[PDB]
């Protein structure tokens, strides 16, 4: 019992981090796509001068 | 493809190509291809209730005006007789194929947004040529707003073989960076 | 945006010649715009079931095409079925369509969704068994439902299937929070109308307050085309799965009779001409009756639950039509005559029934163990009635005075008050939790409640009734 | 999980290095997409049996190449595929990218992913239809392949290469028992695939949640078509789920391949062909339902040394209704597959699971399957359970037992007992073994038959907690010596005084 | 299995930022054939295709 | 078109018309003790009915909300 | 078919007082070739129509005139349909009936019974021939309460 | 997609139409396969006539179509 | 079919030999022709059978016949589908054949190997003067008991056997030993049920069946019959029943 419901807690704890986790990834993707914004400029100008001959 | 509006239009070329009319036959077929556009010409010709003997005195005057064939007549005589008039359109578009299979030439289309002079296409018709392995090439051209500044050619025995470059690049790339 | 013109009528089946350009895709609506008897226009609903070729398709009328011409404009809708879901179907009678049948005027509703529709994708399935808790004593002790799984009411009329259909839908709006609805595919009308008045007696629909009810009904009749039968299978389910969907509920599809959905599918594949398969049956029929029952899940949002009945032909389990629905059906509640005859109700025969959720790891320990000793209990007095005849119940041993007693109590109990029956018999009616019905089975086989009589435990719905009506039974014969 | 900051060199990169190479590629119109059936005109250098692309992305399988046309197998709904739109002949011959980066993915017929967790890689295509192994090419089935059910590993023993059939009714434990075997295979090197044609979706989802709970997702993939998804894709999924498998057969891996059912794909293939409107034969089915089969149950073989001895181990299910073996699916089964197991509902339904009748079930390859301990220890119980059919007969109509009928009788309820198992808890080799030898020598005879199951349990807990030597000596000997039929007796001796207080 | 789904997550959203990034490039890749030169540059590109699918035809 | 009748003397090439009425029969009270044929004029050789409102054969049914439970 | 029977079939119902009280008796007749019920009209008539009256021919050289077989034949409808005199004298008559339809067995054996199952064999016979009737003797309500 | 129409008989037809014609003296073997022969020509036949192939062979005239003869 | 076919008859042809020809099965053959024949788009006969089904069994299975210049002794296995012996494919099969030997589902339920019905069964050969008046006189009066005894099950299948008559009772009895009697363990059989093959030569099989139709041993139980290669086996195994105890 008492090592199950301990066993228990500790599952609900890992869930606990791990939803943070995935959170916290949002956010930084979140941020990511803000910025390296040239990137997305120059990123675009990119294929341009190689798409084509 | 070997179905009855083909079968038809075989033969009608093979009589030709015997005695050498395939250039006066051919005339005279895309002569009847014109006649038959009408919806109340093929109606009448087409429909079981008219009359068969009606249908052969038009037909006969009809031939006159249009100064057909002696065997281009026959033919579509011989239809009427044997009740497939109501297939003419298949038959008409399906001779046009045979009669590039007799000659060796093989038709290309090609597409472009903008027009483009002969020296473009000659290559072309000689690039199908060695391709095809052609005999002879007929070039088709087509004006497309769509793709961007290429063009595509298709030729084979349908317009199954497909080759271009102008949007198809852009696609390529769309998928490629998704790999 | 598309016109065609019917090319020809033959039966049912239509088929309209489309402009080579525009040209619908299979499973898209047609409104054929026809003319009626008088003059005035009336419009056909079609649905496309083949591309012909040439520019043309073979659409499956699905209200009557007498009066239909050759070249008649058909304007494609663009989209299947689009039928009214939403807090507004409550209450109200439905077409195919989504046309209101009941004369309580349009469906003042801005939202549509098609009826062909994927099923939920893997992703989005949940994984955890659950029971579905009726409320029933018989129900939740000896056929235990899935939530989001399919059942099988195997019952005739005169055993009060119909009550039994109300408790649940009256049941699950007021222990949890959800909705039914109900799908009458290819019902007669005079048990659509009878059905329909019993809902408004039991306050299942509320008829002074609508959309306060409990039940969207959709009614699809015999006397409509076979292409109006098979799609109100579908109809009330896209209807069912709004509130799943949107207002995440634990929705009850009750689809009358599954039988006869099958039997539809079939006609209009004969119509379309298709090669029957074996027993004469379509030859889609393994994949019309999954397109039907993969809807009917339990997602992450809410979950649908079929109770769909089910008729065997030729009393054969092994008929194509009986064969095929089985598979998905996950729990069977076998409604009995012979109970209705002695007075039990509701009438569900607990040796018959069976469940697949009735399984110790599903269920717990606990459950699953009084649940077997019921049915044996059930099972030895049964056998057993015929041997009591003959050497009556003193000749009996004394284990075998007793599993008859206990057997007894326990039929007693299984008994009990609907609310929707308050009307008809006066009694209240009793929700009865999982809890204390499996409580309530221990007292009883365990003894501990041998001493009293048998008409306690009769329509009493909590185990503490029982004994309560017992004790008052013993105040009054003392008086 | 930082994406963004390295896009801009990503996005970059796809462009770079592109070819962009031109070269002539069919294409065809479509003429008319009907009944799981797409028919193209072009294409006039189609291979037979070659991927032909729709706009849609839909994929087809070009089989009927007439004269003028192309009949196209429409593999998923042709519900997008709009009449006129065009055709690409891909040059590929009905292929399945494969690789090791399948395994631990749930797969769709097409083998796409549909577990939404992202792509999957792979260098290498096998060919949908190919070939089987031919007549040198195989050699004799030799390896045992543990089920992990008692009933099975004793006595209708399933080796490796082995096609076995499981068949039954519906609700009997097919399921189960495929899918114990998948459980059991862990420490071995078997690549298990499951193939789930034509099942619930909720409950393919279960199986699927199961493994990944008890940790078989890294070594099966779970090829699912679904009740729902088109005739042509359940049709396609098994040749799907055995191309992958013999990836692994091919490389010197061991393979399992359950298909459940193969029922379920025969009437997805009456459906194609009766839509096609080809001429059914007996019970609809068509002519081609045995050669159907054939095909998919002939690749599964136990391969010659000379091609590295891999394996393809076939489970194939299949429902009977109403126990009619004789019906014209199970009996083309039956005569593929070299034995078979009958999983009864008599005894499913009055709680003797795992169903399996035992005196209905063949193995052909029975016990050159079997390891050594196993073939000695299970020859007892094979026997056992021959005497105890007949002794259950006439048991009720003699019912005056005399204690030579009585006490082969009482060890025959108890032998019973052995056989029962609980769902996904499979049995390692030397359990079974020693399962077996106990209930055999009549030291169970004693206890009450709600004890028996008890009782195991804590033999088994016993002696791999304080007797570990047992198990070294049948794995590593496999062969059920002296030195390990006493260190058992004394574990039962010791066990069996425990238990009693 | 938790640190597992970051694993997963960590590769959905990379390949979404690529993709998104990749679409605007051809967004503005578009918006420059558009604007490139027409009969010159767009002859220019015909003629290499058309000199790709006589190289292709040659093999 | 389904015929009504015999088609032995039709011709082919004969014209038909369409009527443009579809399939009513001439209903009243004077029915009662007539036996009639499928198209109701009389067969019993008693001579014409007298009618003079037309219902259809293929008339709808009542529908849900019109009809009653059965209590007679 | 089963929509060309049912488009017929549901014409004939009880109309509601909106619209008059007027009703629409159907009794159809189908005849099932060799007692097959299973077959594809009568499967179509029967779930398309509340009740189901079988006459079995078995009965009908029995002697029980008109061969309606009861125990088969069934009414959805039920005791909505019967007046309230009959309610009362019909119920006790359906289960004296149904005990003898259990008791068919033991008619040959009656000599070796107790009174209860004795009387009710007993009972049930005479129960059986108030059923026959010659034809075309209607018999009035006050005849048959 | 009917037999008779095999692209030698329609020339022929064409090249004689206006004509009157009656081939019933001989028939031209349009298909054969699996015992069965479907002959152009042959309008003098008689259902149940013994017709001779070719290479000497004799069959049966059972079906008398008006294209052609089984 | 045909290619395994045309070797064995060149042998017989020009190395002027005795030529075996095993075929598994050619009911495979047979419906491979009905496979191919939908491609083609001949009409089906009956049920998908091919039309020309006689035909093509019959070029088949006449090519096999024995000449004056050799001989060619074909033992083919016939599938039957469905277990119905009144399928085209089965039922076509049956003219062609000197001996047919049907194999039944039951007597593979109860464990009978070979089960081979002794009564569907039927031989060309099995005639007087081909295989002497004593292997015919018991031949018959081995079927007539089974035969006996098969039309008996229907009654016994209800009461059970304490009705039957003495007469009855005693054929039953004799009919039970009998069939046991014809179950035979084989050489090939020995990795399934590890008991020993039996080769029971023509002249031991006859003495068996004459002294279980003599009576000579009514005494002994049924399973000492069971498996067992001569009649010497069976009253061996007999005594082994009794002795152990
Ligand atoms: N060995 C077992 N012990 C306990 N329960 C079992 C066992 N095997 C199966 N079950 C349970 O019995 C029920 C039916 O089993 P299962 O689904 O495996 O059968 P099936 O033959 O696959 O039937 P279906 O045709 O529905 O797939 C399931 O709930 C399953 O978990
Ligand atoms: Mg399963």
Redesign the pocket.
Same mark, same amino acid.
């Given at each position: 019992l008492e090592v199950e419901a301990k066993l228990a807690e500790g599952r609900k704890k890992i869930e606990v981090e791990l939803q943070e986790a995935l959170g916290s990834l949002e956010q930084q993707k979140e941020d990511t796509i803000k910025s390296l914004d040239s990137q997305i400029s120059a990123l675009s100008d990119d294929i341009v001068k190689k798409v084509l001959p | 493809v070997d179905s009855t509006a083909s079968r038809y239009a075989s033969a009608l070329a093979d009589v030709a190509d015997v005695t050498g009319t395939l250039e006066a036959t051919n005339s005279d077929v895309e002569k009847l291809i014109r006649i038959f556009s009408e919806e109340p010409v093929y109606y009448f010709f087409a429909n079981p209730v008219i009359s068969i003997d009606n249908k052969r005195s038009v037909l006969d005057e009809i031939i006159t005006t249009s100064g057909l064939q002696p065997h281009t007549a026959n033919f579509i005589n011989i239809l009427i007789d044997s009740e497939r008039i109501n297939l003419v359109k298949e038959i008409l578009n399906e001779f046009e194929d045979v009669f590039n299979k007799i000659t060796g030439t093989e038709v290309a289309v090609v597409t472009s947004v903008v027009k483009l002079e002969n020296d473009h296409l000659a290559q072309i018709a000689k690039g199908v040529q060695k391709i095809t392995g052609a005999k002879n090439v007929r070039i088709k051209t087509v004006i497309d707003p769509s793709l961007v500044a290429g063009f595509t050619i298709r030729y084979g025995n349908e317009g199954s073989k497909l080759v271009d470059m102008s949007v198809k690049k852009q696609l390529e790339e769309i998928a490629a960076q998704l790999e | 945006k598309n016109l065609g013109r019917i090319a020809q009528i033959i039966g049912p089946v239509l088929d309209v010649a489309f402009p080579p350009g525009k040209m619908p895709n299979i499973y898209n609506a047609l409104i054929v715009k026809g003319r009626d008897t008088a003059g005035q226009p009336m419009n056909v609903t079609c649905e496309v079931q083949q591309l012909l070729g040439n520019n043309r398709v073979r659409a499956v009328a699905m209200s009557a095409t007498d009066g239909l011409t050759r070249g008649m404009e058909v304007i494609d809708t663009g989209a299947p079925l689009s039928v009214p879901v939403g807090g507004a179907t409550l209450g109200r009678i439905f077409n195919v369509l989504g046309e209101p049948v009941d004369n309580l005027g349009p469906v003042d509703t801005r939202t549509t969704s098609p009826i062909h529709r994927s099923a939920p994708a893997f992703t989005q399935l949940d994984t955890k068994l659950s029971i579905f808790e009726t409320g029933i004593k018989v129900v939740d002790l000896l056929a235990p439902y899935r939530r989001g799984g399919k059942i099988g009411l195997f019952g005739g009329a005169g055993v009060g299937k119909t009550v039994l259909i109300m408790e649940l839908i009256n049941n699950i709006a007021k222990a949890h929070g959800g909705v039914s609805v109900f799908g009458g595919v290819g019902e007669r009308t005079r048990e659509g109308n009878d059905l329909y008045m019993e809902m408004k007696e039991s306050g299942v629909i509320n008829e002074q307050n609508i959309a306060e009810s409990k039940v969207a009904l959709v009614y699809g009749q015999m006397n409509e085309p076979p292409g109006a039968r098979m799609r109100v299978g579908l109809t009330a389910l896209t209807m069912a799965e709004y509130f799943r969907d949107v207002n995440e509920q634990d929705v009850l599809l009750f689809i009358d009779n599954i039988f006869r959905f099958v039997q539809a599918g079939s006609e209009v594949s004969a119509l379309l001409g298709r090669m029957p398969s074996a027993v004469g049956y379509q030859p889609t029929l393994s994949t019309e009756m999954g397109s039907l029952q993969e809807r009917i899940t339990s997602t992450k949002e809410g979950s649908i639950t079929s109770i769909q009945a089910v008729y065997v032909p030729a009393d054969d389990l092994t008929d194509p039509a009986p064969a095929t629905t089985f598979?998905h059906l996950d729990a069977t509640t076998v409604l009995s005559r012979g109970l209705a005859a002695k007075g039990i109700y509701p009438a569900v025969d607990p040796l018959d029934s069976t469940s697949?959720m009735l399984?110790p790891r599903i269920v717990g320990e606990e459950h699953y163990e009084i649940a077997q000793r019921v049915k044996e209990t059930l099972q030895r007095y049964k056998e057993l009635q015929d041997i009591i005849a003959i050497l009556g119940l003193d000749e009996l041993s004394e284990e075998d005075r007793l599993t008859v007693a206990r057997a007894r109590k326990i039929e007693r109990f299984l008994s009990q008050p609907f609310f929707v029956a308050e009307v008809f018999t006066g009694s209240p009616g009793k929700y009865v939790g999982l809890a204390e019905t499996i409580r309530g089975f221990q007292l009883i086989l365990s003894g501990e409640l041998d001493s009293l009589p048998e008409q306690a435990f009769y329509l009493v719905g909590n185990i503490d009734e029982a004994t309560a009506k017992a004790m008052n039974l013993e105040m009054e014969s003392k008086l | 999980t930082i994406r963004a900051d390295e896009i801009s060199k990503i996005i970059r990169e796809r462009i770079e290095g592109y070819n962009r190479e031109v070269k002539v590629v069919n294409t065809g119109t479509v003429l008319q997409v009907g009944d799981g059936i797409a028919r193209i005109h072009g294409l006039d250098e189609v291979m037979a049996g070659e991927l032909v692309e729709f706009e849609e992305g839909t994929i087809g399988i070009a089989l009927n190449l007439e004269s003028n046309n192309v009949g196209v197998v429409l593999m998923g709904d042709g519900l997008m595929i709009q009449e006129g739109s065009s055709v690409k002949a891909t040059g590929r011959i009905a292929q399945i990218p494969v690789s090791e980066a399948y395994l631990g993915r749930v797969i769709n017929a097409l083998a796409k992913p549909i577990d939404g967790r992202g792509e999957i890689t792979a260098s290498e295509s096998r060919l949908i239809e190919s070939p089987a192994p031919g007549i040198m090419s195989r050699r004799s089935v030799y390896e045992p392949l543990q089920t992990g059910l008692i009933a099975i590993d004793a006595m209708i023993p399933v080796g490796r290469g082995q096609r076995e059939l499981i068949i039954?009714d $519906?609700?009997?434990?097919?399921?189960?028992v495929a899918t114990d075997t998948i459980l059991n295979q862990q420490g071995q090197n078997v690549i298990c695939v499951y193939v789930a044609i034509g099942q619930k979706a909720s409950?393919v989802a279960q199986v699927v949640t199961n493994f990944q709970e008890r940790g078989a997702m890294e070594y099966t993939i779970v090829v699912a078509e679904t009740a729902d998804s088109p005739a042509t894709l359940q049709y396609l999924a098994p040749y799907t789920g055995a191309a992958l498998a013999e990836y692994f057969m091919y490389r010197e891996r061991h393979t399992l391949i359950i298909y459940d059912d193969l029922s379920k794909q025969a009437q997805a293939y009456r459906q194609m062909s009766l839509l096609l409107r080809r001429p059914p034969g007996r019970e609809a089915y068509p002519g081609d339902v045995f050669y159907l089969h054939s095909r998919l149950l002939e690749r599964a073989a136990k391969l010659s040394s000379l091609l590295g001895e891999g394996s393809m181990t076939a489970l194939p299910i299949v429902?009977t209704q109403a126990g009619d073996v004789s019906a014209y699916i199970p009996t083309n089964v039956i005569s593929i597959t070299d034995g078979q197991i009958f999983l009864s509902a008599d005894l499913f339904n009055a709680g003797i $699971?795992?169903a399996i009748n035992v005196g209905i079930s063949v193995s052909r390859v029975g016990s050159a399957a079997q390891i050594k301990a196993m073939k000695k220890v299970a020859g007892k119980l094979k026997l056992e359970l021959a005497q105890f059919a007949e002794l259950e007969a006439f048991a009720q109509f003699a019912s005056d037992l005399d204690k030579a009928t009585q006490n082969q009788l009482a060890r025959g309820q108890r032998l019973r007992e052995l056989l029962k198992?609980?769902?996904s808890a499979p049995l390692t080799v030397e359990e079974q073994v020693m399962t077996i030898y106990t209930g055999t020598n009549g030291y169970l005879d004693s206890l009450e038959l709600d004890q028996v199951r008890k009782y195991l349990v804590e033999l088994r807990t016993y002696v791999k907690t304080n007797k570990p030597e047992f198990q070294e000596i049948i794995s590593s000997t496999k062969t059920f010596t002296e030195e390990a039929e006493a260190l058992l007796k004394e574990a039962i001796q010791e066990q069996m005084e425990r238990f009693l207080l | 299995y938790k640190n597992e789904t970051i694993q997963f997550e960590q590769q959905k959203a990379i390949n979404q930022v690529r993709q998104r990034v990749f679409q605007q490039a051809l967004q503005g890749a578009l918006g420059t054939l558009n604007s490139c030169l027409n009969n010159e540059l767009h002859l220019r590109t015909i003629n290499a295709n058309i000199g790709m699918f006589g190289a292709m035809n040659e093999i």
């Open positions: - | - | 598979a697949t399984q | 039954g $519906r609700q009997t434990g097919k399921t189960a409950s429902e $699971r795992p198992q609980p769902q | -």
